[model samples]
Target chain A: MKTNYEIRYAAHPEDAKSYDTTRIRRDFLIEKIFVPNEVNMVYSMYDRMVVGGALPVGEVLTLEAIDPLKAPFFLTRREMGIYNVGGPGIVKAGDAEFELDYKEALYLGSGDRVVTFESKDAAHPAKFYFNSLTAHRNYPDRKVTKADAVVAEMGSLEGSNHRNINKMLVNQVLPTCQLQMGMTELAPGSVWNTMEAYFYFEIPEDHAICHFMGEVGETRHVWMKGDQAVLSPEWSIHSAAATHNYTFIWGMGGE
Target chain B: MKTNYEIRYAAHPEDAKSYDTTRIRRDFLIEKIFVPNEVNMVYSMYDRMVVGGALPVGEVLTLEAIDPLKAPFFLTRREMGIYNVGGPGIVKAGDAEFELDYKEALYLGSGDRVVTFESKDAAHPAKFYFNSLTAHRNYPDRKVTKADAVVAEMGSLEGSNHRNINKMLVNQVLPTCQLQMGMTELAPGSVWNTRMEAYFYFEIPEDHAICHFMGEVGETRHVWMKGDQAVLSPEWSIHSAAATHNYTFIWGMGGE
Candidate 1:
């Protein structure tokens, strides 16, 4: 009953080019990330990927496939990568239960399965950032962290352009249809290298990054919320911003 | 979907003298009540009182008139008193809605209307207990807690036999029908309560089960109890069930 979703259609850059900031935010921003006892999601048109977050407060939450998916179970015809950014949590896929600590991730392969989320401590509710996409077949579910990640020690200090990107859940380390993710730590600097589609996240509340994108001449900027995101289209050029320390879990989908 | 009922017929105490406990429970004890998400009831042949329970959990529940009622609504020719035994709940009678907490009772008079039940919280579902009897006319709906009852302080543990009976829903409190319980076609079982003596046998053909008896009572009998087969009785024998088809019969004599 706590499952909710909104369908997001892919917008052509030409259509987005004429949109105002409010319209742009409504169209592209994923504002609510952590909600009590709910598995909130955005079913996107790009790659038919489902972006969702599950926050378990007092009750254990179920990750349902929802009406849009028309799926018998959450993992039917889909695979998901879940990252717990809040507290220690457990993700149950089918019959297997995996424990995930802070900054840890769990992958669920394509199949028929029941998925549920639970927090180790009710005091510190676990926040699960989930990115799910369609898959061809089933794969073994695996838990990953920086320890299990193909750690890319890049942009360590190119002068506040210092971004330590951990290739946590990627094809290099594990198998997925096309779900690539990275933990972007800005000890302070960043930019959106958004090719066609990708979402940028993580910034302190009241402190923000002006996420701008356009045809170079015409530009648009949305100062997203702390627990918010900017989903880039295939056409718009993604540019990034300035701020205090925060992390961005880049969820990109493709072939 | 939460409704189930069993039909019971009246038994003559003389005939009941040879009945077993199983038959006694079958003919009398209204054992069905308080099944989760269901309304279980027994329609007694005694006063035609319909005793039932309503328990709602996981979903709002509706009290529906079953196939046997043959009337428009449950209260079409009946009146009812509802008492809540579980958690808080809401009941809607026609257009009016009443919130009933534990121990509260609501009286609804005879009428044509829909009735429904809703539990206030999904966590604590409510169970409702109901008693319905025939009514000749309608009365205003009212909710009564113990404070509104005409409390009798008589059997207050008077020799280990304590009983606090509250007169809540009766003609003394409101109003309903009495002896005119009607008929259920003896065969199809029509209705009309005790004012006897008439046997208009019409439209019947072939074999029947409503065997009407007469003569000295030791060895006197005749046949009937299928559609269109009515026979008069001076007030004697008739005991039959498990008949595939039903017929008509007159069952009473001149107490007048």
Candidate 2:
């Protein structure tokens, strides 16, 4: 399939307060971000942020400017952070190309006019998940891995929120305009993740995760098989627990 | 001092976890937004939104372009929603002038190149509370009052969250790019605001309120708030309240 993109405008808390399961899912949930041999994206009106994924099996995929941005190129007025979730891949940004391994991140500044993605091995296609936002100025492009991340060990097994928070592409990690991306790995027998945001869980096939969201007083939950994502609105509290130990990525941008 | 402004970068919930009282207050609390003969503003990194107040006492306060926003005029790339909290005022946007009474609101689109504020009477200077954000398209300027607001009565007196939520300058009330502003007036003896975000309280003098915030329903923290005080409630926190008396508050927010 070819690259497909959609736009999700900002939602009001008042309107969101009465959202049903299907309505809530439609507005905030992104069901399919990574498709085979295509680039899929959602341009969110929240801070005009963009979240997407690119999967290259045998052919290379290029990033194109969406209509709402009204820009000459994808990066004309925006910066992007890419995290490789699949196999090794090569990302070409204008004249420079960088190799991204699984679980590694690459931050591309706003000046880059062109970008392309390709997998080293077609059988094990590279899955590139990205988040982009408006940038006032350009910063240097850099690639970071777990070693480069500012790791913070938070929570405890007793509390059930034990995990390792890897702050990647953050202000403490590197210099970016406003986009911040991070990963959290839950320890064995631990379940809970973060205070007020969603978690994109990467768990084993047999296991499942029960994601909790909505207001603290009036809470709601949803079950996910695996390799799925959910949203945590600013008005709702978000936390999740898996039947088996897992890791997840949490990306946020605003202001 | 010519309109002093400050920039507040966004803080992550992780970093905010260990913030002390002073640090939290510095980052989230607007101790003084309304001042005599001046315009005070805070450019919050949350949604890149700007919150401010203009107290035009006898002098007309012009909305000047702040250094942070590299635009020709203040509203060149932004839209603003203004609500008069005190006295009567006149808001001049381009050539149109809007006479705003107490609790009246005015929404200005992105094309507005100039805006100025003036009080009807110098003795009772108008206190204009405003919020602005980056706008992609232009919409017509409109003035709204309580009659134009979309009202919703939520909660109950027994629950202590009883209030009238006046949705003003919102999609239901008027068309805005992303900025949404509303006022919630608590019924007598009822406290507690919402499930999500911030609260700017308007209470009587002599009355005080203890605002609760933080994660984990069992574990929470309390902040002492007075009349005209505001509290920033994180997405993780549940913001409820207990006041010595009845009070009203204004809440504005953005994001998904």
Determine which window of 10 residues in candidate 2 chain A has minimal summed lDDT: A190-199
Evaluate residue A245 in candidate 1 and report its C-alpha lDDT on the 0 to 100 scale.
44
Which residue runs of candidate 2 sit more than 4 Å off their true CA positions?
A195-199, B1-256
Cα lDDT of candidate 2 equals 0.75
Q: Estimate each model's TM-score.
A: 0.47, 0.49
Query: Using DockQ as the measure, which candidate wins?
Result: 2
The residue pairs in collision within model 2 are: A255-B45, A255-B47, A255-B48
| Alpha carbon deviation, residue B100, candidate 1 (Å) | 90
**What is candidate 1's lDDT per residue for B95-147, written digit by digit as tens?**
99999997677888778999988889868877676766667788788887767
Tens digits of per-residue lDDT for model 1 on A45-65?
Answer: 877878888899878888876
